[PDB]
Amino acid sequence: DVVRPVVRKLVSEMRQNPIDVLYRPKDGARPDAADVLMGMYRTDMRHNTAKI
């Protein structure tokens, strides 16, 4: 193999920068409108199944 180490490097590089949703309120929305839905999203998408 001369290509698989490249795949390993790319996978490790992108695993070092996790990305997840971040809800934000609308322009005219209240400055605390997104807290409850974001909290529920964190609650649901924190188990091992989501990361896997």
Binding site: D1, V2, R4, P5, R8, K9, S12
Partner: protein, 51 residues
């Protein structure tokens, strides 16, 4: 001994021809084997990375 004496004459012939001396060629480890050893070592070094 400071010499290496050789017989010069043969009975039923003239002098010994005494062709130039030949030696068994030294073992070589053909460069195919060495080059493939280097290639295999380099390959193992490249794949032996988890990142």
């Amino acid at each position: 001994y400071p010499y290496y004496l050789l017989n010069r004459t043969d009975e039923n012939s003239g002098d010994l021809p005494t062709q130039p001396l030949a030696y068994y060629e030294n073992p070589e480890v053909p460069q195919a084997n060495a080059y493939m050893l280097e290639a295999a070592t380099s390959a193992v070094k490249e794949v032996a990375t988890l990142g």
